[PDB]
Amino acid sequence: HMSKAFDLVVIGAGSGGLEAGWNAATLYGKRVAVVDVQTSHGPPFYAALGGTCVNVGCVPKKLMVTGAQYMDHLRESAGFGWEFDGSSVKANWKKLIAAKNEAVLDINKSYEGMFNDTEGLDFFLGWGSLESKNVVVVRETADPKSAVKERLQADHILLATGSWPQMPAIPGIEHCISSNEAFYLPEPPRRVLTVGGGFISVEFAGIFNAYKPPGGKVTLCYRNNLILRGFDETIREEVTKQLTANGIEIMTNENPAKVSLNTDGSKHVTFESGKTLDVDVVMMAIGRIPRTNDLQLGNVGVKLTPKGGVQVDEFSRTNVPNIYAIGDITDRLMLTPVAINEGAALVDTVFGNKPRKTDHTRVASAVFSIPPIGTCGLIEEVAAKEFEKVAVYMSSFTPLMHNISGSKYKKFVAKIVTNHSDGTVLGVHLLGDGAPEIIQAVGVCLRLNAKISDFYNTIGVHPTSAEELCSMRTPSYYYVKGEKMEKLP
Amino acid sequence: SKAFDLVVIGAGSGGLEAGWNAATLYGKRVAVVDVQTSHGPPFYAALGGTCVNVGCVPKKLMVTGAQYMDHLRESAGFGWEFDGSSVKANWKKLIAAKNEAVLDINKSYEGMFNDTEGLDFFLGWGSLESKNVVVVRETADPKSAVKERLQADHILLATGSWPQMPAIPGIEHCISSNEAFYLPEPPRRVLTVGGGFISVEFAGIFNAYKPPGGKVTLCYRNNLILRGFDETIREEVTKQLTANGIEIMTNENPAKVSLNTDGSKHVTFESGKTLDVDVVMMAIGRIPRTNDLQLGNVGVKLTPKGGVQVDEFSRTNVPNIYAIGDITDRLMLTPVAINEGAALVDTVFGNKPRKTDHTRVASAVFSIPPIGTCGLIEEVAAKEFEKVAVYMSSFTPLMHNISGSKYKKFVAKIVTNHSDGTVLGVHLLGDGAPEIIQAVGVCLRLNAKISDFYNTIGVHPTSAEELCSMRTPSYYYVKGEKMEKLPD
Ligand SMILES: Cc1cc2nc3c(=O)[nH]c(=O)nc-3n(C[C@H](O)[C@H](O)[C@H](O)COP(=O)(O)OP(=O)(O)OC[C@H]3O[C@@H](n4cnc5c(N)ncnc54)[C@H](O)[C@@H]3O)c2cc1C
Ligand SMILES: Cc1cc2nc3c(=O)[nH]c(=O)nc-3n(C[C@H](O)[C@H](O)[C@H](O)COP(=O)(O)OP(=O)(O)OC[C@H]3O[C@@H](n4cnc5c(N)ncnc54)[C@H](O)[C@@H]3O)c2cc1C
Ligand SMILES: Cc1nccn1Cc1cccc(C#N)c1
Ligand SMILES: Cc1nccn1Cc1cccc(C#N)c1
Ligand SMILES: [Br-]
Ligand SMILES: [Br-]
């Protein structure tokens, strides 16, 4: 065995790394190697070829939220005349997980097939780390003493290893799981606590709520007062109400202090407040941290931020020329389309003679809660710190179809935040069925510096929820040098 | 006799927007005439208009109901189990919930008239007596008892449209969409006549609520349904309706209808083919509602097609008389009528000349699955521009490989002026298409280019992100001719 040489070696065959590698090989004719620890989804390492989104992320969770939405569909169908034997209804979690596994594995195999097929784009199985500025070592395990499978020479090295769930250091943490294990639970839990106020905790609470066996209960806890920090506050409050209305118990200002096993093997959670809760599963979803430990970055001196991500400039360059980093390892916006964008921009800059930096502002994103969130741009309290005068246009109402369906608690919320001095739309925030689909073209609008008049001048599609975005002409309230008020002074 | 700044004939989408804005924004004195205070037989449309009473609002509720036939079947792929043989669709419950929702809107409009200054509602049939006088009568008969005489500085004609019925023997044994909203029972066998959105939408509604053994047939006199929409989507929606059990009869047209002894209908087509159905719903067109207005009393000119002729500011040939909405026989959409009404009042009663933009109007078809579209289809663009590019994406989404509805291909197409990348049209087929397309309408008002779409970061996982992933044209039109690659 001799070492192999490449123009670019990518560590991590995920959302950003695969985009960069495919583009460098097929668009610019470079010789590319990509390293990942596993060729298909699941234990032991959960992520695999395709990345976190494909294997234990956006793709399987969206399939599972879609399955969970049928609990609402079956019940809501009666208002429209549908009759069937309600007593016969069962939610078969094993079938859902098996269908999901097959879909994910099909993607694994297609990525595998393209590496087999594509000239100058090679896959290597193992753990990648940095030996020197131009050599990536591939070992059998994360342990730097494990056996060497390959040495990959590289003119350019891309770090794209993603992130990993954070687990708090509490007694009994070994009795708890993360989202990785949640995707493979043999049976749906009767009682489950999801710990965290972020999108992963909220989304899984909705999944477990639909598939729980008879007499089950889903509890979400969050250590601060209101879940979903960073999202629009009206939407944060409404999502809490609508989760509660669908049977999920939301414990705010509460945080686990320890977990122990009852004699029957269930989990006994004690909170810092002294409250207790018995559940069958505790899922920790308190945050995700960049995966830097195994790369041996000390060997070449790549600088990390205080937070722990790889430090990068606007062009994804580390402090070592010829070493770059994109995606969750940079510990900024942890979204699959941002990682892909960064990968494509980096490759255009390095090999394409067309420099380009990713725009991290006005990125549209979604939460697949039930019902879901779609958002793009600034929340109003952030905008009020940066702009002298901010206007907020707001529409909130239960749609007519949900006055027939029985789900009257399902208010649709649409909000537009503007710089009132010139009308520029600073942000759009949506809650309700369809919000993730509605918000995509809003992202294009904000990239084009749309003003509130551009929205209002556009003729609505009727009847839709989206048309509310094009029917708002008068602010609901304002911020004036940071101060909220119904009217301008 | 009573004096008014504005009299509106027709309390519909456009007429209510115009009257409400004239009163509450400019302080004018406004009278609005309609023939019925709430929905249903005998005149169907009523206070609120066609959309509220027998149009967008109830049909959307009914399409939503029909979608549950798909949801119940598709839930199984995600692990949901229940007694399939116990499922039945209760049409009477559907119609009853729809009726209550519409009536609530009627009452709501009633209270708004009662609560607003300078805004009065009059029940009955309005027609022009003289250039500044509107008469309200008991029936559509111009000899029926006069109820009011309204003198007006300004007159707005906003009476909408009405279903077109072909002149064939037995047309009297057919219904229109008006009656379809009130059928006592869901038809077991039904023929919907027409290729347009109303026929296609009701075909999906009847297909879900039909009793056991039932069958929906849609017929259309030409070769491919949904003329005026994207051709790829026309073919795809044809395929997906067929996959859900609807029979599409193209190049067929009823020649006569006769009554069977059991109450069903015997349809004979021009081709000689025959079909027995319980209901024949004619949905071949809608025509401007001009006949009861006595436009000859004042000389309001019509177009050859029967619309009231208007300029870009909604003015007729008679000074002080205006027309908006379906009566002008242009884009027959509720939000266009609302836009026209508002522009009119801003022009007349404010220092604000304003004309409605009828290009790049987003719209939808609530077929199952639905369509969302905005701007030009490629063969219309190919006549207006020397170089046109078409970007195309078409696949079955992952969820429908699991649901079992593998026929549900999502289609996304972007049409550009290839000379400068300007987006001319966007056309979508699939779950969510009407919601996705709304902000595309805003994009086209910022002269968005194809590069503006693909340089935008996607929201993942969605169908909509497909619009931000298309870099390379699938094919072109050059000087009007379709070709896979460019000449240069
Ligand atoms: C439960 C969940 C749901 C999510 N839902 C969404 C959503 O709806 N939308 C969205 O936009 N984002 C979502 N995300 C976020 C998205 O998954 C990430 O932002 C994205 O995958 C990050 O891409 P990346 O290229 O940084 O890394 P990843 O896609 O994580 O790829 C990194 C890869 O590196 C491999 N690797 C790690 N260390 C090594 C090593 N030393 N050697 C070799 N290989 C290594 C891993 O096996 C992995 O395959 C979700 C995340 C989670 C956890
Ligand atoms: C089945 C169906 C579905 C539709 N779905 C949609 C959809 O999803 N989206 C969409 O945008 N559009 C839809 N439309 C079209 C929409 O309904 C019309 O474009 C819109 O209602 C027209 O508004 P308008 O102001 O011209 O008149 P209308 O809203 O039709 O109002 C006309 C009113 O005038 C009254 N009137 C008539 N003659 C007289 C008279 N002589 N005196 C007094 N009053 C009179 C009538 O009672 C009626 O209330 C649909 C139409 C139909 C038939
Ligand atoms: C098919 C495709 N177009 C864009 C990205 N990809 C994904 C892909 C698949 C296999 C290897 C790589 C790398 N490296 C990337
Ligand atoms: C409240 C409202 N804003 C816009 C339209 N409308 C509806 C409405 C109701 C009753 C009378 C009229 C008139 N004329 C209009
Ligand atoms: Br199960
Ligand atoms: Br045709």
Report phi then psi at B202, rounded to 5. Answer: -70, -30
- Contact (Cβ atoms closer than 8 angstroms) between residue A184 and residue A93: no
Which of A208, A373, A440 should we substitute to test contact with B (largest number of B Cβ atoms within 10 Å)?
A440
Quickly list H helices, B149-192.
Answer: 177-180
In 3D, which of A445, A423, A377, A453 has the Cα closest to residue B447?
Answer: A445
Residue B22 lies in domain: 1-163+285-359
> End-to-end alpha-carbon separation of chain B, Å?
72
* Token pair 């979204």 in the structure block, residue: A335
Ligand nearest to the backbone CA of B295: 2
Considering the domain architecture, whether residues A152 and A294 belong to the same structural domain is answered as yes
Tell me the sheet residues that pair with A193.
A219, A282
Tell me the sheet residues that pair with A419.
A390
Considering the domain architecture, whether residues B17 and B60 belong to the same structural domain is answered as yes
Q: Which two tokens stand for residue B158?
A: 């906003």
* B98: three-class secondary structure by DSSP: helix
Helix B433-444 and helix A435-447, axial crossing angle in degrees, nearest 10: 10
- Contact (Cβ atoms closer than 8 angstroms) between residue B388 and residue B417: yes
Distance from CA of A95 to the nearest CA of B (A): 5
Secondary structure E strands in B164-293: 189-193, 215-220, 247-250, 254-259, 265-269, 274-277, 279-282, 286-288
In 3D, which of B457, B369, B472, B364 has the Cα closest to residue B411?
Answer: B369
Considering the domain architecture, whether residues B223 and B343 belong to the same structural domain is answered as no
Per the annotation, does B13 bind a ligand? Answer: yes
The CATH number assigned to the domain holding A380 equals 3.30.390.30
Residue A480 maps to a domain: no
Residue B57 maps to a domain: yes
Active site residues of A: 462
Residue B485 maps to a domain: no
DSSP code for A329: G
Distance CA B66, CA B437 (A): 22
Residue B483 maps to a domain: no
Residue B441 CA, distance from chain mean position: 17
- Contact (Cβ atoms closer than 8 angstroms) between residue B59 and residue B201: yes
Structure method: X-ray
Considering the domain architecture, whether residues B390 and B439 belong to the same structural domain is answered as yes
Chain B partners of A450 at a C-beta cutoff of 8 Å? 442, 446
Nearest CA in chain B to A365: B459
Report phi then psi at A6, rounded to 5. Answer: -140, 155
Nearest CB to A436 within list B333, B361, B462: B462
Say if the Cβ atoms of A461 and B91 lie within 8 Å.
no
Distances (CA, A) of A460 to A457, A471, B373, B439: 9, 7, 12, 9
Residue A487 maps to a domain: no
- Contact (Cβ atoms closer than 8 angstroms) between residue A268 and residue A291: no
Considering the domain architecture, whether residues B149 and B185 belong to the same structural domain is answered as no
Report phi then psi at B25, rounded to 5. Answer: -100, -30
Considering the domain architecture, whether residues B128 and B3 belong to the same structural domain is answered as yes
Considering the domain architecture, whether residues A32 and A158 belong to the same structural domain is answered as yes
Report phi then psi at A451, rounded to 5. Answer: -105, 165
Q: Which two tokens stand for residue A420?
A: 């009132």
Considering the domain architecture, whether residues B273 and B354 belong to the same structural domain is answered as no
Say if the Cβ atoms of A92 and B80 lie within 8 Å.
yes
In 3D, which of A397, A408, A384 has the Cα closest to residue A481?
Answer: A384
Residue B250 CA, distance from chain mean position: 22
Considering the domain architecture, whether residues A354 and A367 belong to the same structural domain is answered as no
Helix, strand and coil in chain B, % to nearest 5: 35, 30, 40
- Contact (Cβ atoms closer than 8 angstroms) between residue A163 and residue A52: yes
Q: Select from A11, A19, A34, A351 the residue to mutate for testing ligand 3; criterion: most ligand atoms less than 8 Å from CB.
A: A19
Say if the Cβ atoms of A467 and B87 lie within 8 Å.
no
Structural domain count, chain A: 3
Q: Residues of B246-261 as b/e, b for ≥16 C-beta within 10 angstroms?
A: bebbeebbbbebeeee
Chain A partners of B448 at a C-beta cutoff of 8 Å? 444, 448
Distance CA B260, CA B170 (A): 12
Q: Which of A267, A286, A305 is the last residue in one of the domains?
A: A286
Residue A416 maps to a domain: yes
Q: Which of A328, A361, A394 is the last residue in one of the domains?
A: A361
Distance CA A406, CA A410 (A): 9
Considering the domain architecture, whether residues B354 and B370 belong to the same structural domain is answered as no
Say if the Cβ atoms of A88 and B82 lie within 8 Å.
yes
Distance CA B133, CA A16 (A): 71
Considering the domain architecture, whether residues A13 and A124 belong to the same structural domain is answered as yes
In 3D, which of B132, B161, B156, B160 has the Cα closest to residue B313?
Answer: B156
Q: Select from A36, A39, A111 the residue to mutate for testing ligand 3; criterion: most ligand atoms less than 8 Å from CB.
A: A111
Distance CA B290, CA B161 (A): 8
Nearest CB to A469 within list B75, B439, B448: B439
- Contact (Cβ atoms closer than 8 angstroms) between residue A203 and residue A61: yes
Q: Which of A232, A264, A286 is the last residue in one of the domains?
A: A286
Distances (CA, A) of B463 to A425, B235, B398: 24, 20, 10
Contacts of B304 (CB under 8 A, 6+ apart): none
**Given the DSSP bridges, would you call strands A163-165 and A288-290 parallel, antiparallel or unpaired?**
antiparallel
Considering the domain architecture, whether residues B154 and B185 belong to the same structural domain is answered as no
C-alpha A431 – ligand 1 centre gap (Å): 26
In 3D, which of B463, B459, B469 has the Cα closest to residue B414?
Answer: B469
**Given the DSSP bridges, would you call strands A82-83 and B88-89 parallel, antiparallel or unpaired?**
antiparallel
Phi-psi region of A301 (alpha: psi -120 to 50; beta: other; left: phi over 0): left
- Please, what sign has the CA dihedral across residues A235, A238, A244, A249? positive
The CATH number assigned to the domain holding A328 equals 3.50.50.60
Residue A44 maps to a domain: yes
Distance CA B345, CA B378 (A): 36
Which of A74, A410, A444 should we substitute to test contact with B (largest number of B Cβ atoms within 10 Å)?
A444
Q: Is the peptide bond before B142 cis (omega within 30 degrees of 0)?
A: no
Tell me the sheet residues that pair with A283.
A177, A194
Nearest CB to A466 within list B401, B438, B460: B438
Distance CA B4, CA B30 (A): 6
B460 is catalytic: yes
In 3D, which of A469, A462, A459 has the Cα closest to residue B341?
Answer: A459
Chain B partners of A366 at a C-beta cutoff of 8 Å? 459, 462
C-alpha A328 – ligand 3 centre gap (Å): 18
Report phi then psi at A24, rounded to 5. Answer: -65, -40
Distances (CA, A) of B259 to A226, B169, B270, B273, B383: 66, 11, 18, 17, 47
In 3D, which of B400, B418, B394, B405 has the Cα closest to residue B486?
Answer: B418
Residue B92 CA, distance from chain mean position: 24
| Amino acid code (one letter) for B194 | G
C-alpha B251 – ligand 6 centre gap (Å): 9
The H or E element that residue A134 is part of is none
Residue A171 maps to a domain: yes
> End-to-end alpha-carbon separation of chain A, Å?
78
C-alpha B408 – ligand 5 centre gap (Å): 28
Say if the Cβ atoms of A437 and B464 lie within 8 Å.
yes
